Amino acid sequence: MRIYQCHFCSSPCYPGHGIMFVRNDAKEFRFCRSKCHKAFKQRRNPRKLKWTKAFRKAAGKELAVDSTLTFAQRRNVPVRYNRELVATTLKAMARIEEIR
Amino acid sequence: MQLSWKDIPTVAPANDLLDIVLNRTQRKTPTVIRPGFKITRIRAFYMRKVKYTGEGFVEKFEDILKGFPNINDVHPFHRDLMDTLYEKNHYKISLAAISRAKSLVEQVARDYVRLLKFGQSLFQCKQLKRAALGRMATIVKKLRDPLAYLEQVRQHIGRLPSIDPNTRTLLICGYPNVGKSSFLRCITKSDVDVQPYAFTTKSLYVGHFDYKYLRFQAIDTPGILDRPTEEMNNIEMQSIYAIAHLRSC
Amino acid sequence: MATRTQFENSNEIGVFSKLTNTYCLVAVGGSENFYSAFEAELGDAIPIVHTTIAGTRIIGRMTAGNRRGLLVPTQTTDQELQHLRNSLPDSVKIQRVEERLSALGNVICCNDYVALVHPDIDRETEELISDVLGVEVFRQTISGNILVGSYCSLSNQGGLVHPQTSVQDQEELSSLLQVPLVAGTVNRGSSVVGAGMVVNDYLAVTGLDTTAPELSVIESIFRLQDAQPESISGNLRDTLIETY
Amino acid sequence: PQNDYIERHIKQHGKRLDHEERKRKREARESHKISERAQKLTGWKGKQFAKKRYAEKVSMRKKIK
Amino acid sequence: SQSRINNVLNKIHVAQPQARDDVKRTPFIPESVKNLKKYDPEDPNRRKLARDIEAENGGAGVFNVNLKDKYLLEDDEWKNDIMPEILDGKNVYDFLDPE
Amino acid sequence: SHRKYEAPRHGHLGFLPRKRAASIRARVKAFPKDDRSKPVALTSFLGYKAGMTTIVRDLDRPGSKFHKREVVEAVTVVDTPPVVVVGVVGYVETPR
Amino acid sequence: SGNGAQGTKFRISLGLPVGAIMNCADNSGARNLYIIAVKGSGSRLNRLPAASLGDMVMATVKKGKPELRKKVMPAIVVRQAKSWRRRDGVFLYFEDNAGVIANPKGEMKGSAITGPVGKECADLWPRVASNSGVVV
Amino acid sequence: AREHFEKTVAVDSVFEQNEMIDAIAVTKGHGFEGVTHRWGTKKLPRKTHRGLRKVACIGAWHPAHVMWSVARAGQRGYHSRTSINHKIYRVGKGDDEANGATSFDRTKKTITPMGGFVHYGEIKNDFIMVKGCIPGNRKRIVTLRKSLYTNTSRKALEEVSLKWIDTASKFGKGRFQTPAEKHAFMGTLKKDL
Amino acid sequence: MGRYSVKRYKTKRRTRDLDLIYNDLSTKESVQKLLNQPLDETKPGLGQHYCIHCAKYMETAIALKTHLKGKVHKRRVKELRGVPYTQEVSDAAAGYNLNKFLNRVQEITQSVGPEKESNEALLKEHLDSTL
Amino acid sequence: RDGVTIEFSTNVKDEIVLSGNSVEDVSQNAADLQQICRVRNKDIRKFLDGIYVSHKGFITEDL
Numbered sequence A: 001m002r003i004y005q006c007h008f009c010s011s012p013c014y015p016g017h018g019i020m021f022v023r024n025d026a027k028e029f030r031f032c033r034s035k036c037h038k039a040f041k042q043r044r045n046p047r048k049l050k051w052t053k054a055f056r057k058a059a060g061k062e063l064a065v066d067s068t069l070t071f072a073q074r075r076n077v078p079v080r081y082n083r084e085l086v087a088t089t090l091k092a093m094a095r096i097e098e099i100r
Numbered sequence B: 001m002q003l004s005w006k007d008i009p010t011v012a013p014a015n016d017l018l019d020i021v022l023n024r025t026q027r028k029t030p031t032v033i034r035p036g037f038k039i040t041r042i043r044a045f046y047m048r049k050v051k052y053t054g055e056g057f058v059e060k061f062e063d064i065l066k067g068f069p070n071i072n073d074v075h076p077f078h079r080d081l082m083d084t085l086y087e088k089n090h091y092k093i094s095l096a097a098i099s100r101a102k103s104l105v106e107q108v109a110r111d112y113v114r115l116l117k118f119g120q121s122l123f124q125c126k127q128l129k130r131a132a133l134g135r136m137a138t139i140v141k142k143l144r145d146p147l148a149y150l151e152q153v154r155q156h157i158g159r160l161p162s163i164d165p166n167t168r169t170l171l172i173c174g175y176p177n178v179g180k181s182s183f184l185r186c187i188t189k190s191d192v193d194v195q196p197y198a199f200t201t202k203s204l205y206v207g208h209f210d211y212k213y214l215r216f217q218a219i220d221t222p223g224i225l226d227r228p229t230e231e232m233n234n235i236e237m238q239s240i241y242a243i244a245h246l247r248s249c
Numbered sequence C: 001m002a003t004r005t006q007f008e009n010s011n012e013i014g015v016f017s018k019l020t021n022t023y024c025l026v027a028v029g030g031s032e033n034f035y036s037a038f039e040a041e042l043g044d045a046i047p048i049v050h051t052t053i054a055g056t057r058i059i060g061r062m063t064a065g066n067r068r069g070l071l072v073p074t075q076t077t078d079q080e081l082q083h084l085r086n087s088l089p090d091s092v093k094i095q096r097v098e099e100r101l102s103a104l105g106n107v108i109c110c111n112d113y114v115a116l117v118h119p120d121i122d123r124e125t126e127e128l129i130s131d132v133l134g135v136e137v138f139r140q141t142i143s144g145n146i147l148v149g150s151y152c153s154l155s156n157q158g159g160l161v162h163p164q165t166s167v168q169d170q171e172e173l174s175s176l177l178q179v180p181l182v183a184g185t186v187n188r189g190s191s192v193v194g195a196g197m198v199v200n201d202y203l204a205v206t207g208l209d210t211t212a213p214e215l216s217v218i219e220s221i222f223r224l225q226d227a228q229p230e231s232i233s234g235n236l237r238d239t240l241i242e243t244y
Numbered sequence D: 001p002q003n004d005y006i007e008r009h010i011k012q013h014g015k016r017l018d019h020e021e022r023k024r025k026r027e028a029r030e031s032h033k034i035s036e037r038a039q040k041l042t043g044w045k046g047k048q049f050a051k052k053r054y055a056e057k058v059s060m061r062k063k064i065k
Numbered sequence E: 001s002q003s004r005i006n007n008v009l010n011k012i013h014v015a016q017p018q019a020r021d022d023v024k025r026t027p028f029i030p031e032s033v034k035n036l037k038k039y040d041p042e043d044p045n046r047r048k049l050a051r052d053i054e055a056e057n058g059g060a061g062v063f064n065v066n067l068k069d070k071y072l073l074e075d076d077e078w079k080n081d082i083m084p085e086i087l088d089g090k091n092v093y094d095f096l097d098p099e
Numbered sequence F: 001s002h003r004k005y006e007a008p009r010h011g012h013l014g015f016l017p018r019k020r021a022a023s024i025r026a027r028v029k030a031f032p033k034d035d036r037s038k039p040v041a042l043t044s045f046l047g048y049k050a051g052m053t054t055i056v057r058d059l060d061r062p063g064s065k066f067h068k069r070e071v072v073e074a075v076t077v078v079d080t081p082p083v084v085v086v087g088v089v090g091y092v093e094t095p096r
Numbered sequence G: 001s002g003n004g005a006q007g008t009k010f011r012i013s014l015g016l017p018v019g020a021i022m023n024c025a026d027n028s029g030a031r032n033l034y035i036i037a038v039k040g041s042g043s044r045l046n047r048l049p050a051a052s053l054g055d056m057v058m059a060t061v062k063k064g065k066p067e068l069r070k071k072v073m074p075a076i077v078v079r080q081a082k083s084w085r086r087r088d089g090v091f092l093y094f095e096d097n098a099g100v101i102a103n104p105k106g107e108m109k110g111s112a113i114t115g116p117v118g119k120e121c122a123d124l125w126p127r128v129a130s131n132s133g134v135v136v
Numbered sequence H: 001a002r003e004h005f006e007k008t009v010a011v012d013s014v015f016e017q018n019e020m021i022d023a024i025a026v027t028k029g030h031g032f033e034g035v036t037h038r039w040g041t042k043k044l045p046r047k048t049h050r051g052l053r054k055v056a057c058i059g060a061w062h063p064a065h066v067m068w069s070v071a072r073a074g075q076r077g078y079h080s081r082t083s084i085n086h087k088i089y090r091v092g093k094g095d096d097e098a099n100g101a102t103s104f105d106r107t108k109k110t111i112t113p114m115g116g117f118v119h120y121g122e123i124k125n126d127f128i129m130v131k132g133c134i135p136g137n138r139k140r141i142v143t144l145r146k147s148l149y150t151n152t153s154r155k156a157l158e159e160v161s162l163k164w165i166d167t168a169s170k171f172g173k174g175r176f177q178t179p180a181e182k183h184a185f186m187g188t189l190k191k192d193l
Numbered sequence I: 001m002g003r004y005s006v007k008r009y010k011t012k013r014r015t016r017d018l019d020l021i022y023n024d025l026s027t028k029e030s031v032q033k034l035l036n037q038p039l040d041e042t043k044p045g046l047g048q049h050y051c052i053h054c055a056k057y058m059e060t061a062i063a064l065k066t067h068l069k070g071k072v073h074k075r076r077v078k079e080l081r082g083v084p085y086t087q088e089v090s091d092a093a094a095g096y097n098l099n100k101f102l103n104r105v106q107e108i109t110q111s112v113g114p115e116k117e118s119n120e121a122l123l124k125e126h127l128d129s130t131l
Numbered sequence J: 001r002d003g004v005t006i007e008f009s010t011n012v013k014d015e016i017v018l019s020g021n022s023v024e025d026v027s028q029n030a031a032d033l034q035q036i037c038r039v040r041n042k043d044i045r046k047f048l049d050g051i052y053v054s055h056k057g058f059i060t061e062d063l
C-alpha cells in the first residue's frame, strides 16, 4: 500500500478505488473517483475550481507553509529496520497530527 | 526438405486402400433415401457420394506424391545413393504411375458427376453410382504392385541415416574385418557391430564427435573388394560414392 | 565458468537476473531450480536475494547497478524496497529514481567504473548516477542501437555487443570503456546480448542454447578460466572463420 | 535410428521376457475368437467377415488340391 | 570468397583500449569467492542446495519459501516482525527516518 | 435438417422448475457424514447477510504468479449473533 | 498460449476485437496494424474473436512500407486503453491502441519500441521486455 | 444437548479461520421476468413484428407440443441455491473493539462502514467475513454447513493474512476510513465555530 | 455523461496535454524543432504551419493570421501563464513533499518563467516575420 | 490377498517369491502385480521393462 493522493481531488485514494491514467509520457494520473476523472478529461483547472485542495492551498485559505507539513518526504533510502525506531514513529505520527 | 525424410505418412496395400475409402464414404455421408422422394434430392444424394469418394483417393495420393522426396534434383550424393538402394528406374515409374492413377480418378469423377444430373429414376442413378465406384475400384486393383513397393521403401527410408554433404566430414575406409568398427565406437558414441567376419555392416554408419568446438561427423563404410569395378555389389557401391561425392578427409 | 541454465524453459537469463561482483538477484517464480544454480556456483560467498520489482519477474531489466550501489525505478513498492535494504549489507546504496524512462537495465549498462547510458536520459539522473555508482558517465549509442543495456554486456575484463556492430563503432567505444570489445552473438545467435546472459568479474551464466563456439568466445573476452587474455582468440581463428 | 535399430536391439536384449507365451496363447485363444466373432459382429461387418472367411476356405482347398 | 572475410573480421579482431588516462582500474573479486571450494555434484558431504529443501518438505509446486530468515539484522529476534506500514492515513514510510 | 451450426444450450437444465422458492429460509438438503469416533461437533450454523466490502491482502500461493504479492478481492460479511439451543429430534431409518 | 509466452496468460479485459486498427509502436516502419485473427481465442456462435493486452494476434499493415504490406504477420498488443484491472487494486488504461510485431517464437522484428509498454504484457514476453524503454 | 438446553453457542466454537464453508440461501426476487434476461438468449434484431425480445421459432410439426426445454417467460430470482467452497477470512469477535484493525493496520476501528451499511445498521455482534459472494440479498438469512467431506485441494489449505480492511462508506463513493480523517482532512468548518 | 462530452472527449480523440507543450515552451531547441518540421504526407499543412500553444497544424499561413487574431488562441496563452500544475502541485496541497514543491516554484520563478516569456517574445517576431 | 506370503529373494538377484495354499489367491495376486507395471503408449519391442512370471513351482521341493 502506498495510499496515494488524487491528482485532481487532492484527496487520499485507497486501493481498489479510482483509476490510474497513463499518458504516452508514462507518468501516473490516479483519481479518487469518476467525478474528478471526468473533470480531467474535460480538462478543467483545479487551481481555478474551488472545491479541491489545490485551490484552498493556493487561494490563501487553509495554511500551507508550516513545519508540521514538512515530514511527508517520499524517501529514497530504505534504511535498515531497527524495530525500536518504529516504536518512536508510531508515537510520533500520533503526536504530529494533533499539532497540525 | 533435406536429410532423412522420416515423415512420409504411411500407405496400405491396395485392397485395404480401397476398403478404407469406401468405408469412409459409407460412414461419413448419409445413406438413406427413398424412391418416393423428390428427384432433385435423389440426384443430390448420389452426387454427394461420387464427389466425396473422389477426393478420398486423391487426397491420400496427394499425401504420397508430396511425401517421397522426388529423387532427382535432391542432391547428387543422395540422388545416386537411393538408386543403389531403390532403382531410380523402378522408383520414378512407380510414383509417376500414381499421378497417372490420380488424374484418372478425377476424370472418372467429373464425368459421372456430369452424367448424373440427367438421371431420371432411382434405379438409373443407383446403377451409375456402382458403376462409378467400380471403375474407381478397377484403377486401385490395377495399382497393387507399385503400392507394395512403396511400403518397403518407406519403412526403409526413415531408417536411413542423415549425413550432411557440406559439413566437416571424414571417411573411414579399409577392408572388411580390419578394425574400422571398433575404432569408430572408440572415437564416438555410436552403435556399430564389431564382428570379425567380412560383410557384417551393410550400410553406412554415422557418428558425431567434436574438436575445437566444432561439430564433426564420422562416416563408416562397409568395405570394398578388389573386384575390377565393372561388376560390383550394391553393398559395396555405397562405399564408393561416399568417397566420390563428399568433401572429406 | 560459462554456465548454461534455463529459467523454467527460458534461455533469456539476463532478463530474469541481476549479477554483480558482490550480489545476485533472482525472481521468485515457480521453483528454486534457478536460485539453486547460483547457489551451486557462488556458494554462500555473496548474498543472493529473491525479489520482485513492481510485483513482476523481470528484474534484470528494471534494475541497474554495480557492486557499489543499485538503482530501482519509481514503481518499486515499499515492501520490495525495504526487503532489499534488509537483504543487502551496508556497502550498497539503494535508491528509487524517477524519470520518464523506466527500465534501467535497458537505459543503462555499466560496471564498477564507467557507465553507459541512453542518450535521452534527464540530466539530474546523470548527476545522480555518478554520485550513486561512483562511476564515469557517457551518453553514447552502440551502433545506433539506442538501448545500451540490452545490446551490450559489460565487465571489468571485457564487453560484448550485438553482431551488427561496426569495427568503427568498437574502436571508438572501447576507448571509452578501456576494455576489449567483441562483436558477438549468443543463444543460437540472438543479437540481444544483455537479455541473454549475465557476467561479472568471475562468473558468466548464459542459456542452454548458447553454442559451444559461443561459450568459448564469452569465456575469451570476460576471461573466466585462467587465463584467456584474448590471445586465445588467436587460437579460435580456425573456428570463427569456419563458423562465419 | 540410423539403420535397423530394432533388430540390433533384439540381438543384444531380446524381444521381452514373456514374449513366447504371449505369442503362443494368442494362437491358442485364436480358434475361440474367430468362432466368437462370427456369432458377434452384426451390421455388415459380418457381411464383410463372411466373405473374408469364405476366401480362406477357397484358398486352402486350392492349396490342398 | 573475400566478400565474407571482412564481415567475419569484425568478430575476429577485437577492439583495444589505447589506455587513455592516469586512472587505474582493477577487477574486484572478493577472496570469499576465491577461497570457496568447488561444488562436487556427486559429493557425499556438500552444501544442501535449496532444490533439496524444496523437495524434502516438499516438492516444486507445493513448497513455501520463507522469504525471510536470510537477511542481515542487528538481532535475529526481529526477523519475524511485521512492518505496520499504516498508521491512520498518511501511511508510515513517508515518515520514518533516522533522527 | 441438422441445425447447420451447433451451439450449446442456453441456460442450465438442472435448475428446473425455475419457480418461487417455498420459504425465505432454504432447507438444508444434505448434512455431512457421521464418523462415530470423533468428539461431538455441531455441523452447521446460520446468520444474516449484510456485506460486500473489500480486502487487500498478500497471497502465499506457491505456484501462482501472485505468490508473495499483494492482491485485493471482495468479501461478504454475515452478521452472526450467538445461537441458542431449544430442542432435539431423533430420526428413525425406515425402509421408507 | 502456444509458443513464446512464458508463464500463464492472465485474465484481463478484452479490448480490441477483430477488425480494429491499432498503431505500430516499434521502429519497424509501419504505421498501423489491422487485426484479423487472435490466436488462443475461444469459439462461440456469433461471438467475435477479440484481443487484449499481451495477446499474440495475426494482423496486416495499412500504412507503411510496401514491402511490409500485403501479408499477415504476428503481433503482440502492448497498449490497450480499455481499462483493465490490476489485482493490486487499481484500474488503468493507456492512451491508445498499439502493438509490435515479431516472429511466432516472439523475437522482435523491430529494434526498439517507442512509447510505454504495459507491465502485464511485459512479464509475458522477454523480447518485448528486452526492447522496452518504459514499462508502465 | 441435554445440558445445552436454553444455552447459547458462540460462533467461533463452530468454525475458525481458513476453513472452506458453503452458503445456502434464497436469491433476490425480480418478479415476472422477460425470457431474454431470464435465460440469456440472443435478441431478434429490430422492429421485428410482434416483438423482438423473445424466441422466434419454438417447434415443428412433430412433436406437436411445446417441449419442456424451450426457455419460456417467467419468474427470475427468489430461488433456493446451494453454493459451495467459500473461504473464511475473519472470525472477529464483536465484543472486541477494533475488529477492523489487524496486526498490520493498528488503527482502532469497527468493521462497520461509515454511515453503517446500506439498508443495514452496524455490526454489534460477532461476525463472519468470507470472500466471494453469497447467494441472496442483504437483510436475509443464510445457512452455513461445512464442506460435506474432505473437499481439499491446496486452495483449501492456505492460511491467509488480512492486510487491510476497507471500512469507508458505500453509500456513495467512500473516501475516508474513520470519521477522524474526514474531520481531519477537511479542517475545521463553519458550524464547528 | 451526455452526447457532447463523450463525442468531444473520448479517449481516442485527445488533445495534447499542457505540460508537454509547456515543456515545448521551455528551451530554444524545442522552439526550433517545432518550427522546422520537414514534410509529411498525412499532416494537414504537410508538416508546415504548426502553432505550438494551440497544438494544431494549419493548412495555409492565411489560417495563422486568423488564428493568432482569435479568441481561441488568446484563451490558450492565458492558460499557460502560471505554474503548470504537475502531480507535485497536486500532492503538496495534501501536505506531501513540500520540499520538491518549494524548488520548482523557485525554478519557474527564476529560470523557466522569464525564459518562457523570452521564448514567446521570439514567437511573436518570428511568426510576424512571415505574416 | 489373504493367506499368500511374499518374500524378497535373497542370494539370487532381482527375484521375488510368492507362496500360499490356494492356486487362485496366488496366481491372481501374482498376475495383478505384473499387470500393474504395464508399459503404456510406447513401442514394446524396444522397451523390455516390467515384472514377469519367471517360474511356477511347489513349496515342496522335493516331492
Ligand SMILES: [Mg+2]
Residues within 6 Å of the ligand: B176, B177, B195, B197, B198, B199, B200, B201
Ligand atoms: Mg562386416
Ligand SMILES: [Zn+2]
Residues within 6 Å of the ligand: A009, A033, A034, A035, A036, A037, A039
Ligand atoms: Zn471529481
Ligand SMILES: [Zn+2]
Residues within 6 Å of the ligand: I051, I052, I053, I054, I055, I056, I067, I073, I076
Ligand atoms: Zn494557436
